Amino acid sequence: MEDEIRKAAEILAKSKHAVVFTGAGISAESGIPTFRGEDGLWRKYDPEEVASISGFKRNPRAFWEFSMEMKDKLFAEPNPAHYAIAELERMGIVKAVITQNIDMLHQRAGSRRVLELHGSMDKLDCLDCHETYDWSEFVEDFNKGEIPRCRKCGSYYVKPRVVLFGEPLPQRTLFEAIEEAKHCDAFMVVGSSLVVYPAAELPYIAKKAGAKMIIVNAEPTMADPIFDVKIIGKAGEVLPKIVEEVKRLRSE
Amino acid sequence: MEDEIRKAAEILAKSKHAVVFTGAGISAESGIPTFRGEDGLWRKYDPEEVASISGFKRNPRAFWEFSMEMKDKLFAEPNPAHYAIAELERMGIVKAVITQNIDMLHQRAGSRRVLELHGSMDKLDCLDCHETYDWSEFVEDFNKGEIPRCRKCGSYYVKPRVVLFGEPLPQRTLFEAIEEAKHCDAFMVVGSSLVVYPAAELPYIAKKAGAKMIIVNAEPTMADPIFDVKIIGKAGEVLPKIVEEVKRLRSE
Amino acid sequence: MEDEIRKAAEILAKSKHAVVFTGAGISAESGIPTFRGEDGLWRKYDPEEVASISGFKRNPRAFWEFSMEMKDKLFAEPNPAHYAIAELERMGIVKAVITQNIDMLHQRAGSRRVLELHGSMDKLDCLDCHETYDWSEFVEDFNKGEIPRCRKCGSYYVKPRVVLFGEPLPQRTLFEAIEEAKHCDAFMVVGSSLVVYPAAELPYIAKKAGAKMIIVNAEPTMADPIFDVKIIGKAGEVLPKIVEEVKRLRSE
Amino acid sequence: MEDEIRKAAEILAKSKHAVVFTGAGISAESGIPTFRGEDGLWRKYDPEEVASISGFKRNPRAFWEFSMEMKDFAEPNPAHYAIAELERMGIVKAVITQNIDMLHQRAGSRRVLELHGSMDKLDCLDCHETYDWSEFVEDFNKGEIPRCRKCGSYYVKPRVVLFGEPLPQRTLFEAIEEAKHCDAFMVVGSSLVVYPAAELPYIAKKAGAKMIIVNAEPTMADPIFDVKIIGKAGEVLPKIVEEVKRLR
Amino acid sequence: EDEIRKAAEILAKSKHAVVFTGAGISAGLWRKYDPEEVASISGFKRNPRAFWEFSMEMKDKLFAEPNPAHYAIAELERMGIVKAVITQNIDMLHQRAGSRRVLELHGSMDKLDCLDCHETYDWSEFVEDFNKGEIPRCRKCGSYYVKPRVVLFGEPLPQRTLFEAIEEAKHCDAFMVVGSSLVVYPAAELPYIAKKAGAKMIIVNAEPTMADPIFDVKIIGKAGEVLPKIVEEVKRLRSE
């Protein structure tokens, strides 16, 4: 109920190094479907098939069609959950965001420190000649429904710098994520089923370290019982109410 | 004269996707001495306390004072070897440089693609507040014996982005280096003893993939037998000779 | 009598819960070539292509050709190293073997506790109808020049119960190995370059727990510095010498 | 007989930028069999099985064994040479060929566009690894069909255009440019039935270039030519050259 | 883009182009320091520490390196278009970027000499001490008179280098100025010499110069951003 939101807000209000872990859930209200439930059904291709380093090579066009598909929009924008987190960062509470999302919606919402376990599409590399590119370089190509193509050698294997099925995670980033869980005073999960490594392990790491924990998700997860506050609902509706309640605690 | 140099130039002049792997020996002519023993080094200091991530988190000063004592050249500049390799890239022959060095001399010399397997002294991170700095902000203070401290929070936990004991190699970079060894048509080693992974294995990976193999080192290595050309000598002297010869073949 | 061997023995002689971690190097002398250096170069095919889950499905014949390849011998049986380790367990010194090998040589040598991080060829499963099989059941088939084939449904998808490239590492067996390292009093690496996760992590975990560390390998590894005793040599020749010394030390 | 060839020498002699389009017939003199017409291979073999991509993916051993049956170490004949001399003389500017025998190069021709690729390089359809013919040249002669040394696949396809496959893009591009920028286009030993290669003669014809065709028999595309010579390339081409040295 | 395309057209058609560079490529001093004491040969013999202290305080940036304009010019030479680079810069950036024929009108810091025992040195032998804030000292005799081969007030400009640069201007087919105000000789005159000889003129600067009128192509912008773009367009005009 509203009571759970109260306790979440009370934990955050007295934290100065909170960490927020987000999954596909936090971006569903931005038009980017998750890989679960009806969303997984909605999507045509199987992510493990078309979104692997193998699939990318055998059929780059399908990879892009799958990766860019959205609900009633071409490009996504941050929803109130993203802004709510960036706000908490301005209020001196949130000092880091660890995400498995590759949509860069946290940065665009104003988050200053974002650890991207799966990278992002901010940059791309030609796998044949190694020319590097900024996302902005193919804006016109995408606009007309075409896929990225290397201007230097003509290759269609311009791979975005994200972790595809069959590749390792960014270690400098993985290490920072764990170290982040190890010294945060509050650890809040938002929009994650806590299934994809290290999502299932970070919560236990932060708890051992003594952090207070909160989880905001549309459905329950196996780790729910170890959290202090459990909230079932949409991230875009819950987070902003938590922020407001934190402001009210600091005001009144 | 020198059949080896001519042969090396012949192979390169004919390759369109060559890779260069470099070790500490390529920067010896820039003023940065190589290991020289390395075993005795661990007789003076406990490797776990001065060069491991665990030792760093326990007492930062140990790592930094260890570094000041074995400091050496801090303002070294690339030497002829580094430039020769950059020239080869400009000529459309070399497509990537894989290195174990952390001095960034390859980039400063013009190389556009450098895969740093052991990280580099480019940037540092405060482990407490996450502020990031360029090594250029601490070099001089460090040269005066001043341990770098975070200017924003005052922490003594400013960790450089280099690989320490206890932490894994940068996976995505290693992954790229290996792909590089598998599809190159020419693989050249310069100034590396090829004793420990990955230095010790990449040559064998390129060899199995069918690339031509060249090695330029001051002393033989156990991997020598698989090289099509082997040259004994100083990189800073040999490399420019090979390039000159390649240019001549190109101009005929 | 090499002094490092003697030192390794003194450590084991005073241990009552030693753990041995083995890599491909401990079976090379049994005739199973490793994936590194000359062995890797000598082997037919590229491991990641033929020994991956997709390679197995598209070309089982190549997978079995790769898996059964022998070097310097025609069939594999435990070598002196495997027996030495089994003896150390009989002497009440070694309490567990953690291995990444799938050859079952440790069990054949008599070791009772063996944690198989990558599973083993001991069991096979038809991926189509799920009939399960013992390795012994296909011995005659291999001798006649055929590859395993499900006797119940005719499929050639009889996958040995091992971890193939492209498949995740067994999580429960991984956690048991970590726990093993956290409570041993001696941790000895034999025939591993400590490159394949978690081979590079386990030694550090044991060191933090206070274990005495020993490493026996044909070449130096990146983690060599943290071990108390380092021995360069062939496992099959070194291990029995260590055990003979341990028996002498206990003689009085 | 002379009237036709005499007229042919007249055009080439006056030609400033001539292009030669060759088919399997120009290599008949070298012992290599043609595909269609008389004694053609497509009468003693099924192309859909031994020379089609669908057939290769179906049973790679068919293509490779068919290829082993044709193991014949061939050398240029007077036709290939006549074309190379016509090039040294500055008349012929480039040769577009559908053959993979590489007899045009060995004969001394510098401008050779292999519209249908060559056995020079190969690709594994499974792991995408690439190889030079030299890597299999020894197992092939011993009767062993090429097998990828990286993934063990039996789908190592040489870079030759089989039925159901597109032509190499860069090469098709170069060829069309030549068919456009030419005043003389000569076809030699080509049935002109396989497209899009057979389209080049029309592309050059519609661009205003004189058309000459030397073939051992009339092709169903003769009309487009200003003059056709029905005979053997090894005998007709050499005579075309000398007659050009008489005029020139 | 417009002027940039024209510049490329000229360079693509030329076979003996010459490039002149000033300080503006590496994008009151004499009120803070006394030039007569920190930058003249008489001041140096009087007190070498003044010149070296002046240099240390004005070192600029650490781990300095060539920028994209230097690499673009080196590339133009590699393409066989540019045959010489005349510069007033003393930081060896053109050579490091790959240029093979560089005429340094003001000398450079790459070579130094002890004025007492005449031992010669490369800058790499002092760069460490310099950046640590220690004055370069002769290791053979101990003297503090280690002077780099740069032109100091009271010393002459390299005569032979100057004449070679004058000759380049007299026989080039294209002359391109990059990052120079063209106010002081010889910088102010070389463009006029090339102009009179019949070469195509190009100038890339952040600001206009009084010599602007004689130039066939005038581009305003940062050299680091303009040159790579000119080089690209030149490659594009060679693919066709």
Ligand SMILES: NC(=O)c1ccc[n+]([C@@H]2O[C@H](COP(=O)([O-])OP(=O)(O)OC[C@H]3O[C@@H](n4cnc5c(N)ncnc54)[C@H](O)[C@@H]3O)[C@@H](O)[C@H]2O)c1
């Ligand atoms: N960058 C992206 O936006 C994006 C999109 C799809 C998948 N992926 C990534 O791929 C992996 C697998 O994805 P996945 O979807 O299977 O796992 P996930 O755990 O990241 O999935 C989302 C979870 O969100 C919950 N959820 C859905 N809508 C929500 C809302 N409005 N508010 C709060 N919670 C909501 C669901 O109950 C589900 O458990 C993850 O690592 C994920 O982050 C990224």
Ligand SMILES: NC(=O)c1ccc[n+]([C@@H]2O[C@H](COP(=O)([O-])OP(=O)(O)OC[C@H]3O[C@@H](n4cnc5c(N)ncnc54)[C@H](O)[C@@H]3O)[C@@H](O)[C@H]2O)c1
């Ligand atoms: N434990 C061991 O036995 C051992 C042995 C060697 C290296 N290592 C480790 O491996 C890493 C470094 O390996 P690396 O190969 O870069 O360095 P390295 O020190 O092993 O080898 C440098 C090589 O360069 C050669 N060399 C010296 N001057 C040269 C010049 N001017 N031109 C050309 N060659 C020259 C030497 O002969 C030597 O083989 C380090 O992290 C180190 O701790 C461990």
Ligand SMILES: NC(=O)c1ccc[n+]([C@@H]2O[C@H](COP(=O)([O-])OP(=O)(O)OC[C@H]3O[C@@H](n4cnc5c(N)ncnc54)[C@H](O)[C@@H]3O)[C@@H](O)[C@H]2O)c1
């Ligand atoms: N079950 C098997 O026998 C088997 C065989 C090959 C690979 N694999 C597995 O695949 C992975 C990768 O294999 P890899 O070979 O790249 O890694 P690895 O680290 O396991 O490789 C072997 C290491 O063995 C050392 N070595 C070789 N011969 C030796 C001997 N006689 N005595 C002592 N050391 C010796 C080498 O120096 C090298 O560092 C590992 O996890 C490995 O266990 C298993």
Ligand SMILES: Nc1ncnc2c1ncn2[C@@H]1O[C@H](COP(=O)(O)OP(=O)(O)OC[C@H]2O[C@H](O)[C@H](O)[C@@H]2O)[C@@H](O)[C@H]1O
């Ligand atoms: N000595 C000779 N001189 C000139 N022409 C000759 C000679 N001997 C035979 N010919 C003629 O050469 C022509 C060759 O035609 P094809 O066999 O159809 O060969 P081509 O035009 O090269 O087209 C074949 C294409 O189909 C295959 O699938 C393959 O890919 C090949 O490139 C025939 O019309 C034949 O009569």
Ligand SMILES: [Zn+2]
């Ligand atoms: Zn490219």
Ligand SMILES: [Zn+2]
């Ligand atoms: Zn933090």
Ligand SMILES: [Zn+2]
């Ligand atoms: Zn800080």
Ligand SMILES: [Zn+2]
């Ligand atoms: Zn590459």
Ligand SMILES: [Zn+2]
């Ligand atoms: Zn079955």
Ligand SMILES: [Zn+2]
């Ligand atoms: Zn135990």
Ligand SMILES: [Zn+2]
């Ligand atoms: Zn293959």
Ligand SMILES: [Zn+2]
């Ligand atoms: Zn002196």
Ligand SMILES: [Zn+2]
């Ligand atoms: Zn000149």
